[PDB]
Scaffold this active site. Sequence first.
Site: not given
Length: 499
Positions: A306-307
Amino acid sequence: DRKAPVRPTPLDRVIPAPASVDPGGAPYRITRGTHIRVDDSREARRVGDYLADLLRPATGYRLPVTAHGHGGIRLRLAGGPYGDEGYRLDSGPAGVTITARKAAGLFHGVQTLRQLLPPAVEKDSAQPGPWLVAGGTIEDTPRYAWRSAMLDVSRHFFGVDEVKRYIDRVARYKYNKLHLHLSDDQGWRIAIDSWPRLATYGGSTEVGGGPGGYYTKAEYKEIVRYAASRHLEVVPEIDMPGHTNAALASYAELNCDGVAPPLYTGTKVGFSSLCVDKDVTYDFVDDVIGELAALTPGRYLHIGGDEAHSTPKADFVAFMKRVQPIVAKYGKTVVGWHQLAGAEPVEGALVQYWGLDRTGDAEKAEVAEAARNGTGLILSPADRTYLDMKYTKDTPLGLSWAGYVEVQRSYDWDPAGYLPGAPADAVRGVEAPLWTETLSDPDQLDYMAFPRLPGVAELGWSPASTHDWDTYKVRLAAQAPYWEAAGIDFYRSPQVPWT
Ligand SMILES: CC(=S)NC1=CO[C@H](CO)[C@@H](O)[C@@H]1O
Ligand SMILES: [Cl-]
Ligand SMILES: [Cl-]
Ligand SMILES: [Cl-]
Ligand SMILES: [Cl-]
Ligand SMILES: [Cl-]
Ligand SMILES: [Cl-]
Ligand SMILES: [Cl-]
Ligand SMILES: [Cl-]
């Protein structure tokens, strides 16, 4: 008199709602001479002792656990249509019997039994009771095999005993997986022998600074052991290639410029990345996953993903092409956040969807396309099941980037058609994550986890046919005196008509 009811809990008033409830006849009553009778195996005694341990304080009863005789409480393993996790509960004056194929089924039946009993069962000193269990039969099986709760121990660290407390909160509701977020920008929480500074340096602080912490191998094995005795499969996460600052701060040589960043004590995201261009990065990944695989008896390793907003799309795809097979090399199934759906999930992989209603169609399509292509889906929408999300604008703890998530919103949906275009057979289940940017002690964990935690357990367990907010909130309201007797702080939502 809501502390000790005159009359017993209805057989159907259980979270999760059982698949089948057939009330009938008179209740069983536990009295001082009741025995817990189990099959003659170490695993059947294990559940019996777990039941006896739950009931002894508030009953003052001896509740011996034996494999001989005709106990008033009987846990038996038998053939049946109950799968690995289902059970039958029969109750009446002749006794309570819980039947299952496997110990996990008996254990789940125990979790129903403790709600059939009155709230006084939560007290640590002996009580009148009466220890009634409504009469009838419950036949109960789970809708989804992935029913998980995540704890973030990177943002604020929580020790073994605090994880065991949280483990016991989730065991109440028939979760079967415990996802641990073991690394992020503010912390590295698992000792890796090949890379010792990760824990000793990368673990040395947390959000807001000061002492952090980490698990020695022995501490982590004890968490895994404890979780397993509550039938939680532990799913560890080493987030990569983003959310990696604690590791980057720990070894200068992992940074593309060879300079180690400082330890991060803030609460923002997106700025860190492993160095896709360096060979050591993959040596590091291989050692870490190897060591973590060895500590992990469950089937899955979570690699995050993620991210990674300082990793350009092409490097992120590159990185994931290389690291995913390391997981199967060490014998595990890969799990990633649903950003992995855009970097070619390997056969067998699962992805955890953390989008929301405002998420765009292209992003959701990427996830549904991976489902069509055989990737399993874990659903944990950030405006549904993120227990760190504020209830209202006035909630003192938590975040709001996903809006506000009241009790009804968190409960009132159907995983099976939630994602446009996703085959409902691709949905493996749900997860309720609890991120800790804002939470630093167990009472705070409770106030954000309760009362939404049972609801997400219900979405994972119960038939869609039982789903209904107006009746669910009645069942949920009945938990109040149980939580009070147990010392579980919770948000008294105005949407819930609290008992
Ligand atoms: C996979 C996700 S959710 N990435 C993150 C964003 O949202 C969380 C805050 O709710 C934060 O803790 C985490 O790093
Ligand atoms: Cl004894
Ligand atoms: Cl006998
Ligand atoms: Cl089992
Ligand atoms: Cl008494
Ligand atoms: Cl399973
Ligand atoms: Cl508890
Ligand atoms: Cl910051
Ligand atoms: Cl941010």
